[PDB]
Structure 1
Amino acid sequence: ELVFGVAHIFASFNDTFIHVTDLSGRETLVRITGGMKVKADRDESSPYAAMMAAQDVAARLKELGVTAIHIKLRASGGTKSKTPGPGAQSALRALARSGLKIGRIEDVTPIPTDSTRKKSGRRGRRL
């Protein structure tokens, strides 16, 4: 008896969304993110927030009964950035040390085949 569930980790240079969903992809189970964990208005993507939120969701999922987890990695979007956020690695470390069963890890960060114009004009940002 082994049951699988998807975990979307969304790291966008900011709050690290943790979103554990049914393996189908709809009607999610638990969405924790990192916002309601740190109240300092900064360090949302800091490893501490992601680690403690991930250990909390680990305990919750131990209680529920699901153990096997697939991982879906998303980073910002197709128009803001391209690399996974700093907190994603901390979230993976916390899920590893939690004791939950781990399945397959894959990247679902959107990649725009088009060349839609992104923020800031031709001269670009100045910072």
Structure 2
Amino acid sequence: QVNIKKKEKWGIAHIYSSFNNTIIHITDITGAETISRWSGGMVVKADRDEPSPYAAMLAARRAAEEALEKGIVGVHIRVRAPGGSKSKTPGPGAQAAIRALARAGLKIGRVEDVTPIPHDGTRPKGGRRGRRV
């Protein structure tokens, strides 16, 4: 350790938000070092509970003990999701993660709309009558 002047570390937390799964992933402010990666289908046994909020608090609590272990006390949250493939809108882990950070005791800085949104068109699947129900 080369002398630290601030005595506070910051770890930006990418939050990747699917209706099939939730992924929480906090790194250092650069992004060049991965402390910890924890999703919503190690917590559980089944596919239905893979997303939900309750996996998306517990996943975001196991990680939160290892960031406390480094010195990272402040966190910026970068909420995002698959935009080009699917719909951009975040799933059930977005209201969930921020609740999972206020209980873990990690401070909450910036909360951010950085989700992939094309400036353009690309043809997804589903046509004639779009995707059919």
Fold-level similarity (TM above 0.5): yes
- 2:8–2:71 contact (8 Å) kept in structure 1: no
CA distance in 1 between counterparts of 2:113 and 2:32 reads 18
Match of 1:76 among 78, 82, 92: 82
The answer on whether the counterparts of 2:35 and 2:67 sit within 8 Å (CA) in structure 1 is no
Equivalence for 1:29: 35
- Which structure shows the higher helix fraction? 1
Percentage identity across aligned positions? 65
The root-mean-square deviation of aligned C-alpha atoms, in Å, is 1.3
Return the offset for 1:26: 2.3
Alignment length (residue pairs): 127
1:5 corresponds in structure 2 to 11
Query: What is the Cα deviation at residue 3 of structure 1?
Result: 1.2
Q: Distance in 2 between matches of 1:107 and 1:96?
A: 20
Q: What residue is the counterpart of 1:89 in the other structure?
A: 95
* Preserved CA contact (<8 Å) 1:11 1:86: yes
Aligned to 2:4: none
Using the size of structure 1 for normalisation, the TM-score is 0.91
SS at match of 2:45: coil
Q: Which aligned pairs between 1:1-127 and structure 2 lie closer than 5 A?
A: 1-127=7-133
Q: 1:28–1:122: structure 2 CA closer, same or farther, 3 Å change rule?
A: farther
Runs (4+) off by over 4 Å: none
Q: Residue 78 of structure 1: CA displacement?
A: 2.3
1:3-61 deviation line (CA, Å, top 9, x unaligned): 11110111111211111111112232211121211111212111110111111111222
Structure 1 residue 63: Cα displacement: 2.1
Structure 2 runs not aligned, ≥5 long = 1-6
Larger Rg: 2
What amino acid maps onto 1:18 in structure 2? I
